[PDB]
Amino acid sequence: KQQNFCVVELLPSDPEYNTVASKFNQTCSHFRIEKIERIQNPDLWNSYQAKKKTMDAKNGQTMNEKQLFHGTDAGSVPHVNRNGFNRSYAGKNAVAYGKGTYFAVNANYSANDTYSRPDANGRKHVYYVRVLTGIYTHGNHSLIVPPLYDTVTDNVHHPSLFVAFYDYQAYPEYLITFRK
Numbered sequence: 001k002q003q004n005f006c007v008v009e010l011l012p013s014d015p016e017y018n019t020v021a022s023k024f025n026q027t028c029s030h031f032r033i034e035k036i037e038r039i040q041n042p043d044l045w046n047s048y049q050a051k052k053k054t055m056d057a058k059n060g061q062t063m064n065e066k067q068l069f070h071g072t073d074a075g076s077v078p079h080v081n082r083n084g085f086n087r088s089y090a091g092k093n094a095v096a097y098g099k100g101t102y103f104a105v106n107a108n109y110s111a112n113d114t115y116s117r118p119d120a121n122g123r124k125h126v127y128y129v130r131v132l133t134g135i136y137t138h139g140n141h142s143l144i145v146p147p148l149y150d151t152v153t154d155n156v157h158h159p160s161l162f163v164a165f166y167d168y169q170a171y172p173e174y175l176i177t178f179r180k
């Protein structure tokens with residue numbers, strides 16, 4: 001009924017393409033990028049920005065937003081484009097640092113075939129996501145919510161991973177379609 005969306009392909013000549021490709025290529029330059037798409041979900045965006053506003057108000061100097069990677073299967077792409085990373089989708093993720101959605105600092109982490117499952121045509125899907133990491137601590141497998149902390153990480157001093165527990169904590173801004 002809501003969180004309708006549009007999928008807008010970036011021209012390789014679009015500055016936004018150059019920018020996403022760069023971050024991706026820090027760790028995944030051995031992959032070939034077929035396409036980069038912007039997900040335009042105004043309802044999902046506005047919800048994310050409301051959440052951001054409240055967090056920015058409470059965490060003081062903290063830079064609350066990171067751009068992180070999320071590998072998924074072709075079949076979850078329409079679900080994530082509409083709903084973002086909601087509670088039912090969290091159920092589908094691993095549970096190492098809690099029951100939420102997992103995002104990687106580095107693309108190579110997400111580019112694994114366990115996360116970005118190659119589809120029937122060998123294409124893999126990694127979103128480049130705005131995540132409200134805010135104030136985070138070390139996570140563990142029992143958590144259904146953060147212990148509140150905004151997110152949890154594998155390593156507070158040197159994060160590789162973040163887990164978000166709340167709806168509207170992440171915006172799936174870009175979808176990278178690639179192959180081996």
Ligand SMILES: Cc1cccc2c(=O)[nH]c(CS[C@H]3CC[C@H](O)CC3)nc12
Nearest residue numbers: 070071072073092093094102104110115
């Ligand atoms: C646990 C974890 C650690 C690090 C990175 C990721 C990441 O990048 N992606 C994912 C979702 S994996 C996806 C879930 C839906 C299913 O149907 C297809 C597989 N998890 C991650």
